[PDB]
Amino acid sequence: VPLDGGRFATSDLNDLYRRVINRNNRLKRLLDLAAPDIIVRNEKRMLQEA
Amino acid sequence: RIRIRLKAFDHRLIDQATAEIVETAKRTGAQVRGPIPLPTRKERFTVLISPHVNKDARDQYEIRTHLRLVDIVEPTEKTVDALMRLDLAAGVDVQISL
Amino acid sequence: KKRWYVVQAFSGFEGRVATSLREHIKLHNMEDLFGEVMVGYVLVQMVMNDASWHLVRSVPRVMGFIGGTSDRPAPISDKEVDAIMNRLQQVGDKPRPKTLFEPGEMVRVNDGPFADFNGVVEEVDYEKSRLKVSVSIFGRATPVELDFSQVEKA
Amino acid sequence: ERDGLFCARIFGPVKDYECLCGKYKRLKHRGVICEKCGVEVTQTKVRRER
DNA sequence: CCCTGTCTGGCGTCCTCTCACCCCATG
DNA sequence: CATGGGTGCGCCAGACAGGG
Incomplete structure (x- = not known):
C-alpha cells in the first residue's frame, strides 16, 4: 500500500522474495x-544465504 | 506503417465499417493515412435456367466484392491492440500486413 | 607465467574498479606482476604474492578474491568459461529460432500486443528476417509479421 | 507485472470479477482466461489464500 | 570418559495519546 | 532511471570443546 505522498511503502518480505528471485535468475x-x-x-x- | 486491407460484399457495410476502424484508431493513435478505396472484383456467372432445352433464356448474375485501405500511420502498441484484436462487423473480412 | 583470478567488486561500479585497478598498478609499479584486466566479477591476469594480493584488495570498492580459501585463493577452474565466451560472440550476430517457421507451421507469440497467442506462418522471409503468421484475434487470424525471437516454434 | 512477484495468471485478478481490463465487466462468464494478459477471474480476497 | 570452562541463544508488564520520517544516485 | 549493497544488560541453560 502507498503512503500519503504516493511512493509505495513496500514491505520487507517483498525485498526478501525479490532478492531470492533475482539470485535464482x-x-x-x-x-x-x-x-x-x-x-x-x-x-x-549467495542463493543459500538469500 | 500497417496496411489494413478489408473486404466485404456490401458497399454500405464496408464503408460504414471503415468509419469506426479509424475512430478506434484516431482516438488513440491520432494519425491515419486515409480511407483508400480499391477497384472492386466483379465475378460474373451467367448460366442456363431451364432444366432442359431453351439455351437462350439465361440470367446474368454478379457478385461484387469491395476492398478498402486505410494504412494506419503510427505503430504504437496502444493502436496495435485497438485494431488487431478489436475486429468488428461479422461478414466483413479484414486482413492486416504490418 | 601469469595465471587468471576472479575479483569481486560492488556490482555496478565495475568499470571504475577496473580503471582504479590499472591506476594502482601504475602507482605501486608492480608492472611485471599484472597482465590485463577483463570485463559483477572482474577477471585479472596476475601472479600470487601476498604483496600483490594486498594491492588488489587495497584497490577501492573491491570485496576480495573468490576461491577455495583466503590464504591461497584459487586461479580459474574453467568449466563453462569457454561457453560464456563463445555465447557473447554468437549473440553479437545470431538468430534465436533461425526462422525455422516454414509455411503452414504453427508458431507461438510472446512479444508485442500479440503476446500469449499461437498461429501459423503462411509466408516466411529469411532475407527480411520476418515471419508472416496470423494470430486468431476475436477468431479472426490477424496476419502479422513477427521476428524469429518474437515468436517460438510450435 | 505480467509474470512477477505480483502476477495475474499465477494468482488472481486485482478487481473482483473483472479478468483484466477489456474482458468481463458484468456477471456472466466468471473464469474465462482472456488472451490480452493471462489472468484468473475471481473475487478480491482470493489472492490472500493463493 | 568425567568434570570444567566457554560460547551462543532466549527472555524480560498491559492499555492509550500525539509527534516525526521513511534508499542514494547518476552515467 | 532503476538497481544494488558499535564498544554501558544480566541470568539461565544446555551444547560444544577442553582439559583432567
Missing part, C-alpha cells in the same frame, strides 16, 4: 551459458 543464467566452478559456487552460496 542469475544462477539459472549461470546454468545455460553458465560460468566456471568458483563463480557458480559463489552464486549458489
Whole structure:
C-alpha cells in the first residue's frame, strides 16, 4: 500500500522474495551459458544465504 | 506503417465499417493515412435456367466484392491492440500486413 | 607465467574498479606482476604474492578474491568459461529460432500486443528476417509479421 | 507485472470479477482466461489464500 | 570418559495519546 | 532511471570443546 505522498511503502518480505528471485535468475543464467566452478559456487552460496 | 486491407460484399457495410476502424484508431493513435478505396472484383456467372432445352433464356448474375485501405500511420502498441484484436462487423473480412 | 583470478567488486561500479585497478598498478609499479584486466566479477591476469594480493584488495570498492580459501585463493577452474565466451560472440550476430517457421507451421507469440497467442506462418522471409503468421484475434487470424525471437516454434 | 512477484495468471485478478481490463465487466462468464494478459477471474480476497 | 570452562541463544508488564520520517544516485 | 549493497544488560541453560 502507498503512503500519503504516493511512493509505495513496500514491505520487507517483498525485498526478501525479490532478492531470492533475482539470485535464482542469475544462477539459472549461470546454468545455460553458465560460468566456471568458483563463480557458480559463489552464486549458489549467495542463493543459500538469500 | 500497417496496411489494413478489408473486404466485404456490401458497399454500405464496408464503408460504414471503415468509419469506426479509424475512430478506434484516431482516438488513440491520432494519425491515419486515409480511407483508400480499391477497384472492386466483379465475378460474373451467367448460366442456363431451364432444366432442359431453351439455351437462350439465361440470367446474368454478379457478385461484387469491395476492398478498402486505410494504412494506419503510427505503430504504437496502444493502436496495435485497438485494431488487431478489436475486429468488428461479422461478414466483413479484414486482413492486416504490418 | 601469469595465471587468471576472479575479483569481486560492488556490482555496478565495475568499470571504475577496473580503471582504479590499472591506476594502482601504475602507482605501486608492480608492472611485471599484472597482465590485463577483463570485463559483477572482474577477471585479472596476475601472479600470487601476498604483496600483490594486498594491492588488489587495497584497490577501492573491491570485496576480495573468490576461491577455495583466503590464504591461497584459487586461479580459474574453467568449466563453462569457454561457453560464456563463445555465447557473447554468437549473440553479437545470431538468430534465436533461425526462422525455422516454414509455411503452414504453427508458431507461438510472446512479444508485442500479440503476446500469449499461437498461429501459423503462411509466408516466411529469411532475407527480411520476418515471419508472416496470423494470430486468431476475436477468431479472426490477424496476419502479422513477427521476428524469429518474437515468436517460438510450435 | 505480467509474470512477477505480483502476477495475474499465477494468482488472481486485482478487481473482483473483472479478468483484466477489456474482458468481463458484468456477471456472466466468471473464469474465462482472456488472451490480452493471462489472468484468473475471481473475487478480491482470493489472492490472500493463493 | 568425567568434570570444567566457554560460547551462543532466549527472555524480560498491559492499555492509550500525539509527534516525526521513511534508499542514494547518476552515467 | 532503476538497481544494488558499535564498544554501558544480566541470568539461565544446555551444547560444544577442553582439559583432567
